[PDB]
Design a protein around this ligand. Structure first.
Ligand code: NA
Ligand code: NA
Ligand code: NA
Lengths: 138, 153, 138, 138, 153, 153
């Protein structure tokens, strides 16, 4: 059975983000979710992706950052896999909305924990069709 | 009672099954020897119409920090939200109601669906305040009262 | 033979959008197109994606919405799978252009009809390399 | 062994762009890199993707273009597969940053050379987590 | 006639094949006992150069609401577009030609590739109008005529 | 010396292995009959802490056109960058130091981490220049000197 995940937005105040993994459009099959992270359990090639939807009443061009990263035990430090940054993206003062999409292929090892992370947690909107984090084994 | 077609995945055989009602979903399709069996939507789920789903829909509307639940999640309907007191819906956001500045007063307050509505205080009346509720009041009957300032004695 | 589709932009005034499915960069293999929709015919996991390219002479920040959604007979109501919204994205008055990208994994059933849909059909540009809608079975 | 590539940004002044293909997050397996291009060596279906990250100190809304295209011998002219354009994307004068994401499925033949290409090479930022170009065979 | 190399997918054997011309594409490659066979581009397709394609290119340029076909789709070339009358190409858009306001006149109209060009009406001449075509005219020979208004009698 | 657990991929058997130090990575894990074997980070690679990696990290920081190497890539650390002379870091960019205009002078120059700092030249002093370094100087002791212009004789 194909190793796969589609996690969707969830309400908490933590970095990294935490995700819904059962209800609605969520999927999780042969891969684990633990404290915000997807936990690889078969070394291999995977396509990994995340979208996050930002929005606010009053544009002030706070820098927006969107990161997929990896950790394990083997070394005591986050490794960033994909990242977007947005600056000067709304007209100051206006209601605004924009999304960041990341998707790419990675060779990953068993025991790798993958996480998504973000600059302005207040700016994030957590609707399930708008903000998500997934992968599948090739 | 509305119906639905169903090939048996056992005999390939064409049946007319009956749909589960609101609050339920199909739990076993009708076969030759029985009608459809419907089950209750579990928690956090719903079905709102006559349906042939194999699982109930998820109550996927959640309420913003500036919203309250208009309806709640129930086996028969999804949760629904609206702007909390002191806000109005616009372009999918919940905005604070306008205040009318001085020399203006409120001809209609802000509802959940609209802003405050203001007028220039008309002759004979005034408003001292930036208020989202205070309305133009007639001057006092004793310097000439403006629309911003009361008549002075 | 891998179940696959890549649909590309096409000129009509309808919501949902309608797509080219034979000519040029289009592909359609083991999956059907009917009245704007891709019609799943094997329950399974699929990666689904759409890009749409918006543009205009004179920015007025009309809200842009881009949606992938599903319907079937089993329930009489659209279900949204992925969505982007853009607000305050161009400097008012200017020529502008931006795109929305959506892509993710879904478990889908036979008989599912998938469609793309959009706020400002006048704003959409339908070049085949710019505006598209696809999936493949995993 | 799955035919796959993930190329990452690299410092040169050339169009098309040139990529890192060994170090760090790069991957290249059963597919060749030659003078900026990935060289298909098994006719088939592939998902192809590129992100590029643009940034500048002073917004002047230069038009940004991001293209994946193909060439071979069989015809003496580039064929564009995916493209984004951005106009009126930053507030004039400000520090800005934005990314373009493209991803889609293509039937490709052996001997096809794929390349990425871009309007304002000075505006591109080449961090490996920010700017990349990849594919995999289905 | 330009050529192209071809391993037989039957014998692995190296051939030199000949390329199909514009308007055609390779329909069967040359083998030992025959030369290349070329076929006609079907409708909505084209090839514009000497080629060894297994299928003709698609005529994938379509014309905007503000454009007309400069060339049409033909077996020998892709369709090509341009700004319709009253527009000029800029940054991939088709923009309306400028009008010159009053006291300005048209020294050059808008082509498909450029805008209207205006000058301040020179002494002795005027323009009454916002016109994308009207040009500065000499005053009448009878109040002093401005560049915007004619000399009055 | 910090350690790490390791099932033998041969016997499934639980070991406690020892970690490779900075500058090295695991090249063969410890088994029953031997300890861990560590190898040197190749060029363009590094490990900076006690680690159990099967390959060294890549030195993936590269320096902008407006930056210089603060540290270099070394087997023990990643390369590190900073704003070159005449620039300061802000929001991930390297910006030119401010000049103070005339009638202003530099109370603190621009470092790699900050801008130029200026004051209104105080009474008795002046600055003639847009200078990122020139500071307010006392007028000459002979028209009254402004903050922009020297006292004149
Ligand atoms: Na509204
Ligand atoms: Na131009
Ligand atoms: Na800073």
């Amino acid at each position: 059975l194909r190793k796969v995940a589609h996690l969707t937005g969830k309400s908490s105040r933590s970095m990294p983000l935490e995700w819904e993994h059962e209800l609605g459009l969520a999927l999780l099959s042969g891969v684990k979710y633990k404290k915000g992270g997807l936990v690889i359990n078969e070394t291999g090639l995977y396509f990994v992706y995340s979208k996050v939807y930002f929005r606010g009443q009053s544009c002030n061009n706070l820098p927006l950052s969107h990161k997929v990263y990896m950790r394990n035990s083997k070394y005591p430090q986050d490794l960033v896999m994909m990242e977007g940054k947005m600056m000067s993206y709304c007209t100051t003062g206006q209601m605004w909305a924009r999304s960041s999409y990341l998707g790419a292929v990675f060779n990953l090892t068993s025991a790798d924990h993958l996480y998504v992370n973000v600059s302005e947690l207040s700016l994030v909107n957590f609707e399930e069709s708008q903000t998500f984090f997934g992968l599948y084994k090739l | 009672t509305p119906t639905y077609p169903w090939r048996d995945a056992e005999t390939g055989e064409r049946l007319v099954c009956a749909q589960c009602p609101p609050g339920t979903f199909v739990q076993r399709p009708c076969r030759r020897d029985s009608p459809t069996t419907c089950g209750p939507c579990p928690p956090r789920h719903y079905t709102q119409f006559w349906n042939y789903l194999e699982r109930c829909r998820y109550c996927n509307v959640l309420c913003g920090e500036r919203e309250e639940e208009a309806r709640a999640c129930h086996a028969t309907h999804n949760r629904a939200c609206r702007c909390r007191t002191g806000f109005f819906a616009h372009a999918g956001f919940c905005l604070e109601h306008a205040s009318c500045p001085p020399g203006a007063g409120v001809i209609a307050p802000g509802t959940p669906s609209q802003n405050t509505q203001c007028q220039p205080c008309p002759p004979g009346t005034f408003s001292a305040s930036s208020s989202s509720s205070e309305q133009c009041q007639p001057h006092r009957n004793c310097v000439p009262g403006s629309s911003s300032h009361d008549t002075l004695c």
